[PDB]
Amino acid sequence: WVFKGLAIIIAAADATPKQKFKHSFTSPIFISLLKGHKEEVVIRNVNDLKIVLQALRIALDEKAGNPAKIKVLANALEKKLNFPGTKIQLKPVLNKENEVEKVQFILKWGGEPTHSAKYQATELGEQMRQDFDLLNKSILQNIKIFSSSERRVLHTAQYWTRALFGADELGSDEISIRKDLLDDSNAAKDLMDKVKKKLKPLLREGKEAPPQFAWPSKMPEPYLVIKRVVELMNYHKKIMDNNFAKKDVNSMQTRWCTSEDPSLFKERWDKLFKEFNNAEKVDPSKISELYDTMKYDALHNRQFLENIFDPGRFMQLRELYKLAKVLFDFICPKEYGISDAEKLDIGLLTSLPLAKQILNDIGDMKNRETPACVAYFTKESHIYTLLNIIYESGIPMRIARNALPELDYLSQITFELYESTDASGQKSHSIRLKMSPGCHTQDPLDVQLDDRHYISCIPKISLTKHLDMDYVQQKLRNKFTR
Ligand SMILES: O=P(O)(O)O[C@@H]1[C@@H](OP(=O)(O)O)[C@H](OP(=O)(O)OP(=O)(O)O)[C@@H](OP(=O)(O)O)[C@H](OP(=O)(O)OP(=O)(O)O)[C@@H]1OP(=O)(O)O
Ligand SMILES: NCCC[C@H](N)C(=O)O
Ligand SMILES: [Zn+2]
Protein backbone atom coordinates (compact mmCIF):
# COMPACT_ATOMS: atom_id res chain seq x y z
CA TRP A 1 0.00 0.00 0.00
CA VAL A 2 1.07 3.58 -0.74
CA PHE A 3 -0.38 6.87 0.48
CA LYS A 4 -2.69 8.71 -1.93
CA GLY A 5 -4.74 11.22 0.06
CA LEU A 6 -5.91 12.50 3.43
CA ALA A 7 -9.27 13.89 4.56
CA ILE A 8 -8.74 15.33 8.05
CA ILE A 9 -11.40 17.04 10.17
CA ILE A 10 -9.93 19.33 12.83
CA ALA A 11 -11.71 20.95 15.76
CA ALA A 12 -10.93 24.41 17.09
CA ALA A 13 -7.87 25.04 19.25
CA ASP A 14 -7.92 26.42 22.80
CA ALA A 15 -10.66 29.00 23.34
CA THR A 16 -12.30 30.95 26.14
CA PRO A 17 -15.29 29.35 27.88
CA LYS A 18 -18.59 29.41 26.02
CA GLN A 19 -21.40 30.88 28.13
CA LYS A 20 -25.03 31.59 27.33
CA PHE A 21 -28.29 32.79 28.84
CA LYS A 22 -31.47 31.41 27.27
CA HIS A 23 -35.05 32.51 27.92
CA SER A 24 -38.24 32.32 25.86
CA PHE A 25 -40.77 35.14 25.54
CA THR A 26 -44.13 35.48 23.81
CA SER A 27 -44.74 39.23 24.14
CA PRO A 28 -44.97 41.19 20.87
CA ILE A 29 -41.88 43.31 21.56
CA PHE A 30 -39.82 40.12 21.79
CA ILE A 31 -41.48 38.65 18.69
CA SER A 32 -40.73 41.87 16.79
CA LEU A 33 -36.99 41.27 17.23
CA LEU A 34 -37.32 38.57 14.55
CA LYS A 35 -38.36 41.33 12.11
CA GLY A 36 -40.77 38.99 10.35
CA HIS A 37 -38.37 36.05 10.07
CA LYS A 38 -39.81 32.63 10.90
CA GLU A 39 -36.41 30.90 11.10
CA GLU A 40 -33.47 31.28 13.46
CA VAL A 41 -31.93 34.76 13.36
CA VAL A 42 -28.37 35.52 14.49
CA ILE A 43 -27.34 39.04 15.56
CA ARG A 44 -23.62 39.86 15.63
CA ASN A 45 -23.28 43.48 14.51
CA VAL A 46 -22.45 45.60 17.54
CA ASN A 47 -24.88 48.35 16.51
CA ASP A 48 -27.72 45.83 16.14
CA LEU A 49 -26.84 44.51 19.61
CA LYS A 50 -27.15 48.05 20.98
CA ILE A 51 -30.62 48.28 19.42
CA VAL A 52 -31.63 44.97 21.01
CA LEU A 53 -30.27 46.23 24.34
CA GLN A 54 -32.59 49.22 24.04
CA ALA A 55 -35.47 46.87 23.22
CA LEU A 56 -34.65 44.84 26.34
CA ARG A 57 -34.74 48.01 28.45
CA ILE A 58 -38.15 48.80 26.95
CA ALA A 59 -39.32 45.24 27.61
CA LEU A 60 -38.19 45.54 31.23
CA ASP A 61 -40.12 48.77 31.82
CA GLU A 62 -43.20 47.43 30.03
CA LYS A 63 -42.97 44.11 31.91
CA ALA A 64 -43.11 42.26 28.59
CA GLY A 65 -41.72 39.25 30.46
CA ASN A 66 -40.21 38.09 33.72
CA PRO A 67 -38.52 41.36 34.80
CA ALA A 68 -35.80 39.60 36.80
CA LYS A 69 -34.87 37.43 33.82
CA ILE A 70 -34.95 40.42 31.46
CA LYS A 71 -32.64 42.36 33.80
CA VAL A 72 -29.92 39.69 33.65
CA LEU A 73 -30.15 39.55 29.85
CA ALA A 74 -29.91 43.33 29.50
CA ASN A 75 -27.04 43.69 31.98
CA ALA A 76 -25.14 40.79 30.41
CA LEU A 77 -25.64 42.20 26.91
CA GLU A 78 -24.54 45.68 27.98
CA LYS A 79 -21.28 44.36 29.43
CA LYS A 80 -20.43 41.96 26.60
CA LEU A 81 -21.67 43.50 23.34
CA ASN A 82 -18.30 45.29 23.05
CA PHE A 83 -16.45 41.95 23.26
CA PRO A 84 -15.73 39.85 20.14
CA GLY A 85 -17.81 36.70 19.88
CA THR A 86 -20.96 38.08 21.53
CA LYS A 87 -24.11 37.28 19.55
CA ILE A 88 -27.86 36.81 19.98
CA GLN A 89 -29.86 33.92 18.51
CA LEU A 90 -33.64 34.19 18.10
CA LYS A 91 -35.32 30.82 17.57
CA PRO A 92 -39.01 31.27 16.68
CA VAL A 93 -41.57 28.65 17.66
CA LEU A 94 -44.30 28.18 15.06
CA ASN A 95 -47.88 27.18 15.80
CA LYS A 96 -50.08 25.12 13.50
CA GLU A 97 -50.73 28.13 11.23
CA ASN A 98 -47.02 28.94 10.74
CA GLU A 99 -47.40 31.94 13.06
CA VAL A 100 -44.65 32.79 15.54
CA GLU A 101 -46.12 32.26 19.02
CA LYS A 102 -42.84 32.29 20.97
CA VAL A 103 -39.19 33.25 20.47
CA GLN A 104 -36.18 31.85 22.30
CA PHE A 105 -33.75 34.64 23.25
CA ILE A 106 -30.23 33.17 23.46
CA LEU A 107 -27.37 35.47 24.44
CA LYS A 108 -23.96 33.89 23.78
CA TRP A 109 -20.49 35.25 24.53
CA GLY A 110 -16.98 33.91 24.84
CA GLY A 111 -15.63 31.10 22.73
CA GLU A 112 -12.79 33.27 21.44
CA PRO A 113 -9.38 31.77 20.59
CA THR A 114 -6.92 32.16 23.43
CA HIS A 115 -3.31 33.24 23.02
CA SER A 116 -2.47 29.53 23.35
CA ALA A 117 -4.47 28.43 20.29
CA LYS A 118 -1.69 29.36 17.87
CA TYR A 119 0.77 26.95 19.51
CA GLN A 120 -1.56 23.96 19.18
CA ALA A 121 -2.41 24.80 15.56
CA THR A 122 1.23 25.53 14.67
CA GLU A 123 2.29 22.28 16.34
CA LEU A 124 -0.18 20.38 14.16
CA GLY A 125 0.79 22.20 10.97
CA GLU A 126 4.52 21.62 11.43
CA GLN A 127 4.08 17.93 12.30
CA MET A 128 1.94 17.39 9.20
CA ARG A 129 4.40 19.30 7.02
CA GLN A 130 7.07 16.95 8.32
CA ASP A 131 4.84 13.94 7.65
CA PHE A 132 4.15 14.98 4.05
CA ASP A 133 7.79 15.73 3.23
CA LEU A 134 8.52 12.09 4.17
CA LEU A 135 5.61 10.42 2.32
CA ASN A 136 5.43 12.56 -0.83
CA LYS A 137 6.56 16.16 -1.27
CA SER A 138 3.91 16.59 -3.98
CA ILE A 139 1.13 16.52 -1.36
CA LEU A 140 1.98 20.09 -0.35
CA GLN A 141 1.07 21.19 -3.90
CA ASN A 142 -2.49 19.80 -3.64
CA ILE A 143 -3.90 21.13 -0.36
CA LYS A 144 -7.56 22.13 -0.20
CA ILE A 145 -8.77 23.80 3.01
CA PHE A 146 -12.29 24.45 4.30
CA SER A 147 -13.26 26.16 7.54
CA SER A 148 -16.30 27.05 9.59
CA SER A 149 -17.22 30.72 9.90
CA GLU A 150 -16.83 30.56 13.69
CA ARG A 151 -13.98 32.80 14.79
CA ARG A 152 -12.22 30.20 16.95
CA VAL A 153 -12.30 27.71 14.06
CA LEU A 154 -10.97 30.02 11.34
CA HIS A 155 -8.27 31.19 13.76
CA THR A 156 -7.17 27.56 14.05
CA ALA A 157 -7.25 27.08 10.27
CA GLN A 158 -5.11 30.17 9.64
CA TYR A 159 -2.25 29.25 11.98
CA TRP A 160 -2.32 25.62 10.82
CA THR A 161 -2.08 26.79 7.20
CA ARG A 162 0.83 29.11 8.04
CA ALA A 163 2.69 26.27 9.77
CA LEU A 164 1.97 23.76 6.99
CA PHE A 165 3.37 25.94 4.18
CA GLY A 166 5.87 27.93 6.25
CA ALA A 167 4.45 31.35 5.40
CA ASP A 168 3.73 34.63 7.18
CA GLU A 169 0.94 36.14 5.07
CA LEU A 170 -2.10 34.31 3.72
CA GLY A 171 -4.66 35.00 1.02
CA SER A 172 -8.41 34.53 1.34
CA ASP A 173 -8.28 32.22 -1.70
CA GLU A 174 -6.51 29.52 0.33
CA ILE A 175 -9.17 28.90 3.02
CA SER A 176 -12.78 28.49 1.87
CA ILE A 177 -15.59 29.05 4.37
CA ARG A 178 -18.38 26.45 4.19
CA LYS A 179 -21.15 27.32 6.64
CA ASP A 180 -23.37 24.57 5.21
CA LEU A 181 -20.74 21.94 6.08
CA LEU A 182 -18.87 23.12 9.17
CA ASP A 183 -21.15 25.45 11.17
CA ASP A 184 -23.79 24.21 13.58
CA SER A 185 -27.14 23.25 12.07
CA ASN A 186 -30.44 23.50 13.95
CA ALA A 187 -31.71 20.57 11.84
CA ALA A 188 -31.22 18.16 14.76
CA LYS A 189 -32.28 20.69 17.41
CA ASP A 190 -35.86 19.40 17.28
CA LEU A 191 -34.58 15.93 18.20
CA MET A 192 -31.84 17.11 20.57
CA ASP A 193 -34.56 18.74 22.69
CA LYS A 194 -36.26 15.35 23.01
CA VAL A 195 -32.94 14.10 24.40
CA LYS A 196 -32.31 17.10 26.67
CA LYS A 197 -35.70 16.67 28.35
CA LYS A 198 -35.03 12.95 28.81
CA LEU A 199 -31.81 13.79 30.68
CA LYS A 200 -33.34 16.27 33.15
CA PRO A 201 -34.99 13.62 35.39
CA LEU A 202 -31.77 11.59 35.42
CA LEU A 203 -29.86 14.53 36.91
CA ARG A 204 -32.63 16.10 39.02
CA GLU A 205 -35.02 13.31 40.01
CA GLY A 206 -34.05 10.87 42.74
CA LYS A 207 -34.55 7.78 40.58
CA GLU A 208 -35.02 7.46 36.81
CA ALA A 209 -34.17 4.26 34.92
CA PRO A 210 -32.19 5.00 31.73
CA PRO A 211 -32.20 2.61 28.77
CA GLN A 212 -28.80 2.10 27.10
CA PHE A 213 -27.01 4.82 29.09
CA ALA A 214 -23.27 4.38 29.59
CA TRP A 215 -22.10 5.11 33.14
CA PRO A 216 -19.05 3.84 35.07
CA SER A 217 -19.59 1.26 37.79
CA LYS A 218 -17.38 3.01 40.36
CA MET A 219 -19.60 6.11 40.29
CA PRO A 220 -22.93 6.53 42.12
CA GLU A 221 -26.10 7.56 40.28
CA PRO A 222 -25.93 10.81 38.27
CA TYR A 223 -28.40 12.60 40.54
CA LEU A 224 -26.13 11.97 43.54
CA VAL A 225 -23.13 13.33 41.63
CA ILE A 226 -25.16 16.44 40.83
CA LYS A 227 -26.11 16.87 44.49
CA ARG A 228 -22.47 16.68 45.58
CA VAL A 229 -21.38 19.15 42.88
CA VAL A 230 -24.04 21.58 44.10
CA GLU A 231 -22.69 21.14 47.63
CA LEU A 232 -19.15 21.75 46.37
CA MET A 233 -20.25 24.76 44.30
CA ASN A 234 -22.13 26.44 47.15
CA TYR A 235 -19.07 25.70 49.30
CA HIS A 236 -16.64 27.41 46.93
CA LYS A 237 -18.98 30.37 46.43
CA LYS A 238 -18.68 31.24 50.13
CA ILE A 239 -14.88 30.87 50.05
CA MET A 240 -14.62 33.09 46.98
CA ASP A 241 -16.78 35.85 48.47
CA ASN A 242 -14.90 35.68 51.76
CA ASN A 243 -11.56 35.97 49.95
CA PHE A 244 -12.76 38.81 47.71
CA ALA A 245 -14.28 40.63 50.69
CA LYS A 246 -11.28 40.21 53.01
CA LYS A 247 -8.01 39.57 51.16
CA ASP A 248 -6.05 41.55 48.58
CA VAL A 249 -7.22 39.89 45.37
CA ASN A 250 -4.73 41.65 43.07
CA SER A 251 -1.84 39.83 44.80
CA MET A 252 -3.21 36.28 44.46
CA GLN A 253 -1.41 35.89 41.10
CA THR A 254 1.92 37.45 40.19
CA ARG A 255 0.83 38.16 36.60
CA TRP A 256 -2.52 39.05 35.04
CA CYS A 257 -3.16 39.20 31.29
CA THR A 258 -5.95 40.00 28.86
CA SER A 259 -8.85 37.64 29.66
CA GLU A 260 -6.92 36.45 32.76
CA ASP A 261 -7.82 38.91 35.53
CA PRO A 262 -9.77 38.35 38.76
CA SER A 263 -12.78 40.42 37.67
CA LEU A 264 -13.53 38.21 34.67
CA PHE A 265 -12.92 35.17 36.88
CA LYS A 266 -15.53 36.26 39.42
CA GLU A 267 -18.03 37.03 36.65
CA ARG A 268 -17.77 33.54 35.14
CA TRP A 269 -18.02 31.69 38.45
CA ASP A 270 -20.75 33.95 39.84
CA LYS A 271 -22.86 32.82 36.88
CA LEU A 272 -22.04 29.13 37.35
CA PHE A 273 -22.62 29.32 41.11
CA LYS A 274 -26.10 30.67 40.34
CA GLU A 275 -26.73 27.78 37.94
CA PHE A 276 -25.32 25.10 40.29
CA ASN A 277 -27.00 25.98 43.60
CA ASN A 278 -30.09 23.75 43.19
CA ALA A 279 -29.66 20.14 42.10
CA GLU A 280 -33.36 19.96 41.20
CA LYS A 281 -32.85 22.84 38.73
CA VAL A 282 -29.55 21.95 37.03
CA ASP A 283 -29.67 22.36 33.24
CA PRO A 284 -27.69 19.61 31.44
CA SER A 285 -26.43 22.28 29.03
CA LYS A 286 -24.60 23.98 31.92
CA ILE A 287 -22.40 20.98 32.74
CA SER A 288 -20.24 21.81 29.71
CA GLU A 289 -20.04 25.47 30.76
CA LEU A 290 -18.91 24.49 34.26
CA TYR A 291 -16.28 22.12 32.89
CA ASP A 292 -15.12 24.56 30.20
CA THR A 293 -14.38 27.32 32.71
CA MET A 294 -12.68 24.81 35.01
CA LYS A 295 -10.39 23.74 32.17
CA TYR A 296 -9.81 27.40 31.30
CA ASP A 297 -8.91 28.58 34.81
CA ALA A 298 -6.70 25.61 35.66
CA LEU A 299 -5.01 26.36 32.31
CA HIS A 300 -4.88 30.18 32.24
CA ASN A 301 -5.52 31.33 35.86
CA ARG A 302 -3.87 28.52 37.78
CA GLN A 303 -2.41 30.52 40.68
CA PHE A 304 -5.52 32.63 41.25
CA LEU A 305 -7.68 29.50 41.06
CA GLU A 306 -5.68 28.06 43.96
CA ASN A 307 -5.75 31.17 46.12
CA ILE A 308 -9.32 32.41 45.62
CA PHE A 309 -10.73 28.97 46.52
CA ASP A 310 -8.29 28.31 49.39
CA PRO A 311 -10.30 27.94 52.62
CA GLY A 312 -7.25 28.27 54.88
CA ARG A 313 -4.91 20.72 44.10
CA PHE A 314 -7.05 21.48 47.15
CA MET A 315 -9.13 18.49 48.17
CA GLN A 316 -12.55 20.13 47.89
CA LEU A 317 -11.36 21.60 44.57
CA ARG A 318 -9.89 18.37 43.21
CA GLU A 319 -13.13 16.63 44.15
CA LEU A 320 -15.11 19.29 42.26
CA TYR A 321 -12.94 18.94 39.14
CA LYS A 322 -13.12 15.13 39.21
CA LEU A 323 -16.91 15.06 39.55
CA ALA A 324 -17.36 17.69 36.82
CA LYS A 325 -15.24 15.64 34.42
CA VAL A 326 -17.45 12.60 35.07
CA LEU A 327 -20.57 14.60 34.19
CA PHE A 328 -18.86 16.02 31.10
CA ASP A 329 -17.71 12.54 30.01
CA PHE A 330 -21.06 10.75 30.43
CA ILE A 331 -23.77 13.45 30.16
CA CYS A 332 -22.54 15.97 27.58
CA PRO A 333 -21.73 13.38 24.85
CA LYS A 334 -25.34 12.20 25.14
CA GLU A 335 -26.77 15.58 24.19
CA TYR A 336 -26.01 14.17 20.72
CA GLY A 337 -28.10 11.05 21.42
CA ILE A 338 -28.51 8.47 24.18
CA SER A 339 -29.56 5.38 22.23
CA ASP A 340 -27.75 4.21 19.11
CA ALA A 341 -30.74 5.26 17.00
CA GLU A 342 -30.65 8.75 18.54
CA LYS A 343 -26.89 9.08 18.04
CA LEU A 344 -27.43 7.97 14.44
CA ASP A 345 -30.22 10.34 13.45
CA ILE A 346 -28.80 13.33 15.35
CA GLY A 347 -25.41 12.49 13.87
CA LEU A 348 -26.87 12.46 10.36
CA LEU A 349 -29.13 15.50 10.76
CA THR A 350 -26.06 17.46 11.92
CA SER A 351 -23.20 16.26 9.70
CA LEU A 352 -24.73 14.55 6.65
CA PRO A 353 -23.56 17.32 4.26
CA LEU A 354 -20.02 17.12 5.63
CA ALA A 355 -20.12 13.31 5.52
CA LYS A 356 -21.10 13.36 1.83
CA GLN A 357 -18.37 15.92 1.15
CA ILE A 358 -15.70 13.70 2.74
CA LEU A 359 -16.70 10.60 0.78
CA ASN A 360 -16.78 12.53 -2.50
CA ASP A 361 -13.35 14.02 -1.78
CA ILE A 362 -12.15 10.52 -0.90
CA GLY A 363 -13.68 9.33 -4.16
CA ASP A 364 -11.84 12.04 -6.08
CA MET A 365 -8.52 11.22 -4.40
CA LYS A 366 -8.67 7.64 -5.71
CA ASN A 367 -9.05 8.87 -9.30
CA ARG A 368 -6.33 11.53 -9.07
CA GLU A 369 -2.82 11.12 -10.44
CA THR A 370 -1.25 13.43 -7.81
CA PRO A 371 -1.66 12.93 -4.05
CA ALA A 372 -3.75 15.48 -2.20
CA CYS A 373 -5.06 16.48 1.22
CA VAL A 374 -8.34 18.07 2.27
CA ALA A 375 -8.55 19.68 5.71
CA TYR A 376 -11.92 20.54 7.26
CA PHE A 377 -11.76 22.89 10.26
CA THR A 378 -15.04 22.47 12.11
CA LYS A 379 -16.97 23.49 15.18
CA GLU A 380 -16.92 21.10 18.12
CA SER A 381 -20.32 19.58 17.30
CA HIS A 382 -19.39 17.93 14.00
CA ILE A 383 -16.62 15.83 15.59
CA TYR A 384 -19.01 14.14 18.01
CA THR A 385 -21.68 13.56 15.37
CA LEU A 386 -19.29 12.33 12.67
CA LEU A 387 -17.79 9.72 15.00
CA ASN A 388 -21.30 8.44 15.74
CA ILE A 389 -21.93 8.03 12.01
CA ILE A 390 -18.70 6.02 11.76
CA TYR A 391 -19.66 3.57 14.50
CA GLU A 392 -23.38 3.26 13.73
CA SER A 393 -22.57 2.54 10.06
CA GLY A 394 -21.60 -1.05 10.88
CA ILE A 395 -17.94 -0.52 9.94
CA PRO A 396 -15.71 -2.87 11.99
CA MET A 397 -13.87 -0.76 14.56
CA ARG A 398 -10.74 -1.46 16.58
CA ILE A 399 -11.94 0.35 19.73
CA ALA A 400 -15.38 0.76 21.28
CA ARG A 401 -16.98 4.17 21.73
CA ASN A 402 -17.08 4.01 25.53
CA ALA A 403 -13.32 3.42 25.48
CA LEU A 404 -12.66 6.49 23.33
CA PRO A 405 -10.80 9.30 25.14
CA GLU A 406 -12.41 12.61 26.01
CA LEU A 407 -12.54 14.99 23.07
CA ASP A 408 -10.64 18.22 23.68
CA TYR A 409 -9.31 21.19 21.72
CA LEU A 410 -7.88 20.39 18.28
CA SER A 411 -9.27 16.85 18.26
CA GLN A 412 -9.14 15.29 14.81
CA ILE A 413 -10.85 12.68 12.65
CA THR A 414 -8.65 11.22 9.92
CA PHE A 415 -9.42 9.31 6.71
CA GLU A 416 -6.16 7.93 5.28
CA LEU A 417 -6.26 6.68 1.69
CA TYR A 418 -3.83 4.06 0.38
CA GLU A 419 -3.93 2.79 -3.20
CA SER A 420 -3.03 -0.64 -4.58
CA THR A 421 -2.10 -0.10 -8.23
CA ASP A 422 -0.27 -3.46 -8.19
CA ALA A 423 -1.63 -6.79 -9.45
CA SER A 424 -1.39 -5.52 -13.03
CA GLY A 425 -3.30 -2.30 -13.62
CA GLN A 426 -5.98 -3.43 -11.16
CA LYS A 427 -6.26 -0.53 -8.71
CA SER A 428 -7.67 -1.19 -5.23
CA HIS A 429 -7.76 1.18 -2.27
CA SER A 430 -7.72 0.80 1.51
CA ILE A 431 -8.96 3.41 3.98
CA ARG A 432 -7.85 3.56 7.62
CA LEU A 433 -9.69 5.83 10.05
CA LYS A 434 -7.84 7.46 12.95
CA MET A 435 -8.77 10.06 15.56
CA SER A 436 -7.04 12.16 18.19
CA PRO A 437 -8.64 13.64 21.33
CA GLY A 438 -6.63 16.81 20.71
CA CYS A 439 -4.64 18.80 23.28
CA HIS A 440 -5.75 17.04 26.46
CA THR A 441 -4.32 16.55 29.94
CA GLN A 442 -5.83 14.12 32.44
CA ASP A 443 -4.43 16.15 35.38
CA PRO A 444 -5.23 19.82 34.73
CA LEU A 445 -4.77 20.73 38.41
CA ASP A 446 -1.30 19.10 38.52
CA VAL A 447 0.42 19.92 35.21
CA GLN A 448 2.94 22.77 35.50
CA LEU A 449 2.82 25.27 32.64
CA ASP A 450 4.82 28.32 31.60
CA ASP A 451 3.45 31.62 30.29
CA ARG A 452 2.29 29.86 27.10
CA HIS A 453 -0.39 27.94 29.06
CA TYR A 454 -0.13 25.42 26.24
CA ILE A 455 -1.15 21.75 26.22
CA SER A 456 0.52 19.50 23.66
CA CYS A 457 -1.52 17.41 21.24
CA ILE A 458 -2.12 13.70 21.83
CA PRO A 459 -0.96 11.42 18.97
CA LYS A 460 -3.58 9.75 16.82
CA ILE A 461 -5.10 6.36 17.67
CA SER A 462 -6.33 3.91 15.05
CA LEU A 463 -10.08 3.31 14.87
CA THR A 464 -9.85 0.73 12.06
CA LYS A 465 -7.30 -1.25 10.09
CA HIS A 466 -6.93 -1.11 6.30
CA LEU A 467 -10.43 -1.64 4.90
CA ASP A 468 -11.66 -1.97 1.32
CA MET A 469 -12.69 1.48 0.10
CA ASP A 470 -15.85 0.35 -1.68
CA TYR A 471 -16.94 -1.38 1.53
CA VAL A 472 -16.43 1.61 3.83
CA GLN A 473 -18.39 3.89 1.47
CA GLN A 474 -21.36 1.52 1.16
CA LYS A 475 -21.82 1.01 4.90
CA LEU A 476 -21.89 4.79 5.31
CA ARG A 477 -24.12 5.48 2.30
CA ASN A 478 -26.62 2.80 3.39
CA LYS A 479 -27.45 4.80 6.53
CA PHE A 480 -28.03 8.06 4.63
CA THR A 481 -31.62 6.96 3.93
CA ARG A 482 -32.83 7.53 7.50
O1 LIG B 1 -40.04 29.17 28.15
P1 LIG B 1 -39.44 27.84 27.76
O2 LIG B 1 -40.48 26.75 27.93
O3 LIG B 1 -38.98 27.88 26.32
O4 LIG B 1 -38.15 27.53 28.74
C1 LIG B 1 -38.41 26.90 29.97
C2 LIG B 1 -38.04 25.42 29.84
O5 LIG B 1 -36.67 25.33 29.53
P2 LIG B 1 -36.16 24.35 28.31
O6 LIG B 1 -37.35 23.76 27.57
O7 LIG B 1 -35.33 23.23 28.90
O8 LIG B 1 -35.33 25.17 27.35
C3 LIG B 1 -38.29 24.69 31.16
O9 LIG B 1 -37.81 23.38 31.00
P3 LIG B 1 -38.88 22.14 31.16
O10 LIG B 1 -38.18 20.89 31.65
O11 LIG B 1 -39.97 22.55 32.12
O12 LIG B 1 -39.56 21.84 29.69
P4 LIG B 1 -41.01 22.49 29.27
O13 LIG B 1 -41.31 23.63 30.22
O14 LIG B 1 -42.10 21.45 29.39
O15 LIG B 1 -40.91 23.00 27.86
C4 LIG B 1 -37.58 25.34 32.34
O16 LIG B 1 -38.08 24.75 33.52
P5 LIG B 1 -37.13 23.67 34.29
O17 LIG B 1 -36.34 22.88 33.27
O18 LIG B 1 -36.17 24.39 35.21
O19 LIG B 1 -38.02 22.74 35.09
C5 LIG B 1 -37.76 26.87 32.44
O20 LIG B 1 -36.78 27.32 33.34
P6 LIG B 1 -37.14 28.47 34.46
O21 LIG B 1 -36.34 29.71 34.18
O22 LIG B 1 -36.77 27.96 35.84
O23 LIG B 1 -38.73 28.82 34.32
P7 LIG B 1 -39.98 28.06 35.08
O24 LIG B 1 -39.81 26.57 34.91
O25 LIG B 1 -39.92 28.44 36.53
O26 LIG B 1 -41.30 28.49 34.49
C6 LIG B 1 -37.59 27.56 31.08
O27 LIG B 1 -38.02 28.90 31.18
P8 LIG B 1 -37.19 30.06 30.35
O28 LIG B 1 -36.40 30.88 31.34
O29 LIG B 1 -38.18 30.94 29.62
O30 LIG B 1 -36.24 29.43 29.35
N1 LIG C 1 -32.60 24.00 7.77
C1 LIG C 1 -31.90 23.42 8.78
C2 LIG C 1 -30.39 23.49 8.53
C3 LIG C 1 -29.89 24.90 8.25
C4 LIG C 1 -28.79 25.38 9.18
N2 LIG C 1 -29.32 25.57 10.45
C5 LIG C 1 -28.15 26.65 8.65
O1 LIG C 1 -28.69 27.75 8.83
O2 LIG C 1 -27.08 26.47 8.03
ZN1 LIG D 1 -3.28 31.98 29.27
Numbering used by the authors: 537 to 848, 924 to 1093
How do the authors describe this structure?
Inositol pyrophosphates (PP-InsPs) are eukaryotic nutrient messengers. The N-terminal kinase domain of diphosphoinositol pentakisphosphate kinase (PPIP5K) generates the messenger 1,5-InsP8, the C-terminal phosphatase domain catalyzes PP-InsP breakdown. The balance between kinase and phosphatase activities regulates 1,5-InsP8 levels.
Next, we replaced the catalytic loop residues Arg547, His548 and Arg551 in ScVip1PD Δ848-918 with alanine and obtained crystals in complex with the substrate 1,5-InsP8 diffracting at ~2.4 Å resolution (ScVip1PD Δ848-918 RHR-AAA). Notably, the GAF domain adopts a “closed” conformation in the substrate-bound structure. The GAF domain adopts a closed conformation in both monomers. In both binding sites, all phosphate groups of 1,5-InsP8 are well defined by electron density, with the 1-β-phosphate facing away from the active site. Conserved basic residues from the GAF domain and the α-insertion domain contribute to the formation of the outer substrate binding surface. Most of the basic residues contributing to the outer and the inner 1,5-InsP8 binding surfaces map to the central β-sheet of the GAF domain. Comparison of the outer and inner substrate binding sites in ScVip1PD suggests that the 1,5-InsP8 substrate may undergo a ~90° rotation upon entering the active site.
